[PDB]
Amino acid sequence: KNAADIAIIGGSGLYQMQALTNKRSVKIETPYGEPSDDIVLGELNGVTVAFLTRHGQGHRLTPSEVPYRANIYALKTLGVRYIVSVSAVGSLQETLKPLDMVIPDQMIDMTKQRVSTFFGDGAVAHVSMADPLCPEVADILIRAYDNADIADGQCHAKATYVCIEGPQFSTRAESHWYRQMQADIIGMTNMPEAKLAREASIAYATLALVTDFDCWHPNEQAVSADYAIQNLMKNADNAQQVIKQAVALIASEQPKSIAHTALTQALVTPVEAMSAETKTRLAALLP
Amino acid sequence: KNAADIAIIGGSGLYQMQALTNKRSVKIETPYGEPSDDIVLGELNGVTVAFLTRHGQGHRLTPSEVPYRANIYALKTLGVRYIVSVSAVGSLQETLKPLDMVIPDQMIDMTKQRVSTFFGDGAVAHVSMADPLCPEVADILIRAYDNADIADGQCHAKATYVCIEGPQFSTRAESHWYRQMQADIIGMTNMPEAKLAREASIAYATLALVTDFDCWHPNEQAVSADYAIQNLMKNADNAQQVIKQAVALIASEQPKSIAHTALTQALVTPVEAMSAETKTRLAALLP
Amino acid sequence: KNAADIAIIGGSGLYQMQALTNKRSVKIETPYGEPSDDIVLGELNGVTVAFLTRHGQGHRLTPSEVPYRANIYALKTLGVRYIVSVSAVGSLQETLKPLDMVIPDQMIDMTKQRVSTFFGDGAVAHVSMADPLCPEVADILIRAYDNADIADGQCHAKATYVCIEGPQFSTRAESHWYRQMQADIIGMTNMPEAKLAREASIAYATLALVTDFDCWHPNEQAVSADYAIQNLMKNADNAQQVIKQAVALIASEQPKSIAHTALTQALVTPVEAMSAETKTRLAALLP
Ligand SMILES: CCN(CC)c1ccc2c(-c3ccccc3C(=O)O)c3ccc(=[N+](CC)CC)cc-3oc2c1
Ligand SMILES: CCN(CC)c1ccc2c(-c3ccccc3C(=O)O)c3ccc(=[N+](CC)CC)cc-3oc2c1
Ligand SMILES: CCN(CC)c1ccc2c(-c3ccccc3C(=O)O)c3ccc(=[N+](CC)CC)cc-3oc2c1
Ligand SMILES: CCN(CC)c1ccc2c(-c3ccccc3C(=O)O)c3ccc(=[N+](CC)CC)cc-3oc2c1
Ligand SMILES: CCN(CC)c1ccc2c(-c3ccccc3C(=O)O)c3ccc(=[N+](CC)CC)cc-3oc2c1
Ligand SMILES: CCN(CC)c1ccc2c(-c3ccccc3C(=O)O)c3ccc(=[N+](CC)CC)cc-3oc2c1
Ligand SMILES: [Cl-]
Ligand SMILES: [Cl-]
Ligand SMILES: [Cl-]
Ligand SMILES: [Cl-]
Ligand SMILES: [Cl-]
Ligand SMILES: [Cl-]
């Protein structure tokens, strides 16, 4: 009977959602192997939410090895229609400061080595990622931030997230180049997660937590190393207040998302043309 | 006795060449496994042409999983000296409109996960891709287009094709970025096909069929979804007329291509230095 | 008892270091398989240096298949604290001419298919690559060049190296694009080598040998093909004089490098949290 309309995918610094009631863990098997950790289900004011720690318990996974296809497939099997990804990012812009949040509206996928589709091997589909972060969810995030009355920082909307492979932080020349491409924040995880969520017909948007300037800033002075985890911990607690507010808005407003029908004019291979093995592997994504 | 000097690699919307006479299919085994489909051989005015459907019958393959090395190796075994790749593309430029054709002269390889050389594991070679689309074949395509007297659209030469991994269409920020890199059209398939054709000493050029603006255009209005396959079908039939004319010109003119000797000053490992296994795998490419 | 504080990783045209005395070869097993070739140990004026031919004997490896993790791991096991990578590059800038040397201070990793970290599968670490080429070693290289009194060319410092996957040389549009990103030289090998050296806490810098303009120059005239190996051979012999001088300076000056402590605030997984298998695989990199 385990079902949730709304999921939170928690990034660096988010290993649990403390405030959920009647917490219970579910191990979901998928055709893509195991998700990053058992998915936690609980209620935030009677609204059932699924919480998935992207890096697993103890932060055991690097961005490149996160099982993105299992995680999105598992959330699909729970009936999730809305995902909020909560991710630590570096800032590429002077006006986006540590402890600010950013709700990007665009993304550029610079990742190299990640499987970034559920398709292939028997089924062809080409979803549009023109608007890769659902504006109805992004608008909710903006009002959720304001509703949370956060003491530190501000929230910026309409930014571009560039996703890199990792795990190392960027060289200065790479940071300069991402700036020239008009990117605003940098992270390692929201691709291929945004692509996969779209293929799975799930509305997906990102609440980014600015943890520092990328390296385009000479952090050289002895005043940089340990504050950086402490601000990651402060960001994470601010993020929890924002999520509380956002879950409330999604539950009451239930916005229509273009993601919800993304597969239907993108699927090239008719379901009747798929092999038994292909249909079985794609079962939760197909109408 | 199955030999062809000229091959057409057909993209989205091109699953056959109807006009060829004495059609016959050949299954070619290669050291890279099977090509995308049986290669069809037939005569266009007594000129033997090989036709290969890049996506296989029924459009079964996504761009990332096309067996590019098998396809080019197989066409090499038939003695093909000239390839025309016929590919559906998105436009990144206002003046390149749906139903136009584009004959690019440059390419940028943004693909991530494709094996993009026949070399490695026993043999080292570094071919130049400075001019990655043979200008002698591109010039033939331009005159072929004019000779075909196409009713809809115009043909543009001297454009840059950016090849992305796919399968999803680009985000708006990615489209903006490709524009800033001076790319003109976007597709998913002509890399590594152009690199492999060059390593195989085969002259290779692209006839691109504009199927729509990339996403940098708000197709939002209900007036976009189904016309998009119908214009892909119109493009494909216009393309057939162009190919008819181009095969005629290549057959009569037999232009000299720099691709024809591309391997000879690029090969670092002397053939006498290769292992038996390496020589056998590379046999059709070596002098 | 085989130990060296300093290693030279030799690129195209560098298959040995002739001047070392009491040469002896060591085969090092690593958890990442075998290095590119047996590492040669010898003394340059009584200073022990390790010499590793990146492409193996006979130039047998392409850039994509070099075992970068084995090579860096093996040099770590010898106690190497300083690496000079000596690499052939193409120039993207008019003022960087064939036979010049370039000591870059920045790098952009455009490679696609290379394992670019020792981390994952049990251990998470995020080293900063903000300054990816140790300025203390780069400054030594500059003074080493001057000390070597090279007859042909000049040496340029403070350049950006863009690393591409290879093996083909760049299209003109790609060369144009790398110019627009403010890159100065192009090579195929120093990523992921620079990332891995940083994770291994080894100071790493590059002596780049300009072997020609990239393709952004019409080498068309019959005056280009064979001079290109002869200038690669002249570069290589100039490089040996520079290395002689650089080894001397590193040995006497022993500069402190930020690389030397790069792992200590970057490691996320506590050593006590790693599995036996993970600790064993990472043993030489861990404190
Ligand atoms: C030389 C520039 N300095 C070094 C002292 C830094 C320092 C930290 C980062 C971080 C970062 C990551 C985790 C915790 C704190 C930080 C921080 O900054 O202070 C980053 C954290 C994320 C990030 N995004 C880039 C992929 C990925 C999330 C970029 C980051 O860049 C940093 C640069
Ligand atoms: C290799 C990458 N190229 C870039 C254009 C593509 C992209 C899309 C298609 C589509 C297609 C594209 C967008 C949305 C829906 C479809 C679809 O398919 O429904 C197609 C849709 C139908 C189709 N035919 C298969 C024979 C239908 C007769 C072929 C299609 O080919 C495509 C090729
Ligand atoms: C939001 C922007 N709109 C959505 C309604 C579109 C719509 C379609 C495409 C297509 C496309 C692909 C197959 C059939 C028709 C189309 C079309 O456009 O109408 C494309 C087809 C190819 C293409 N190249 C990009 C890789 C690959 C061929 C890009 C395309 O971009 C499209 C954007
Ligand atoms: C790792 C990537 N780097 C970028 C410069 C390269 C690139 C090319 C070569 C070549 C080379 C380059 C272009 C055309 C022909 C050759 C060739 O090789 O014939 C070489 C050609 C000969 C050669 N020697 C092998 C010991 C010949 C003595 C070494 C070569 O090394 C190259 C390295
Ligand atoms: C059309 C442009 N012309 C063709 C005649 C060339 C010619 C050579 C290169 C070389 C190159 C590589 C090995 C030996 C000599 C050369 C050379 O140039 O003359 C290169 C050698 C390295 C290089 N870096 C690019 C990856 C890699 C080392 C780029 C190179 O670009 C070249 C372009
Ligand atoms: C997925 C990519 N994102 C980009 C910011 C990152 C990047 C870094 C961290 C770090 C981190 C970052 C930089 C330097 C040291 C660390 C560290 O870790 O010591 C972390 C350091 C500690 C940590 N906590 C694990 C639960 C400590 C409580 C989490 C960290 O998460 C990171 C995430
Ligand atoms: Cl932790
Ligand atoms: Cl920092
Ligand atoms: Cl179809
Ligand atoms: Cl459309
Ligand atoms: Cl050689
Ligand atoms: Cl040359």
From TrEMBL, chains A, B, C:
<protein>
    <submittedName>
        <fullName>RsfP</fullName>
    </submittedName>
</protein>
